[PDB]
Amino acid sequence: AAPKNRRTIEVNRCRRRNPQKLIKVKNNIDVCPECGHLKQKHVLCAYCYEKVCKETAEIRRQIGKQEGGPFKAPTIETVVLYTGETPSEQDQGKRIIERDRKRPSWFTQN
């Protein structure tokens, strides 16, 4: 089926600029208490999620240098250690992961 007549711009504006087609304003945007960057109420902060992944990748790179190959997953717990720290009383019989960097403030030692 082919158009019988050309649709005019006046008809087109009513369809293209209809409120349904228009982008809806979002009212769920709030500032992150930690860094001040913008975030949504039901979504984790992009800036705060990126810093965790940057630190996680470095930790996972240290794991690779200790395992030294695939199919070598340890059967014990893992502990991440930074400069200026010693294994805890509960951190006995676990795999200590050394990081040559100061412990991040948001990363609480447990």
Partner: protein, 166 residues
């Protein structure tokens, strides 16, 4: 081609008299040859039209359209330009005055169809124009109420004359 929007920033006004009111700062900025449809760009430009500079950025930051990232980059460099070059005291004071998209120079390619047929595909480009005015955004026009409707209707009944006579 036309590049008047760039020249709209180079106009210098005469010094104001001491009794004259403060003139709001106007900043004209644009980005040319954006690889985006102007029709799709219009929805993003219509969204932030009339908003504050910080409110516009928040809407564009969580918008999934590709032009949202492009427009946000234009607003950041326009906000920086206003303080650096246009003598604007507060960067957040700015609000969106004019925000529209325009057609850009487009390429033409051949899109192959079946039965040895073909169509002419164009690589669409668009321009984005933004104008910033210093000062709080104007309050939105309140919806017309019954008293406003009643006052106008009675005025129409009072302005009618006896037509086709003396």
């Amino acid at each position: 081609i036309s590049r008047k929007w760039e020249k709209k920033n180079k106009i210098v006004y005469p010094p104001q008299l001491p009794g004259e009111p403060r003139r709001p700062a106007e900043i004209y900025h644009c980005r040319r040859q954006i690889k985006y449809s102007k029709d799709k760009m219009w929805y993003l430009a219509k969204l932030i039209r009339g908003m504050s500079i910080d409110q516009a950025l928040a809407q564009l930051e969580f918008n999934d359209k590709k032009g949202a990232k492009i427009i946000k980059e234009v607003l950041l460099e326009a906000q920086d330009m206003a303080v650096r070059d246009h003598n604007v005291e507060f960067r957040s004071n700015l609000y969106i005055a004019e925000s529209t998209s325009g057609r850009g120079q487009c390429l033409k390619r051949i899109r192959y169809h079946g039965r040895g047929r073909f169509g002419i595909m164009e690589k669409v480009y668009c321009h984005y124009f933004v104008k910033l005015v210093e000062g709080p955004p104007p309050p939105p026009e309140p919806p017309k109420t019954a008293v406003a409707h009643a006052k106008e209707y009675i005025q129409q009944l009072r302005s009618r004359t006896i037509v086709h006579t003396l």
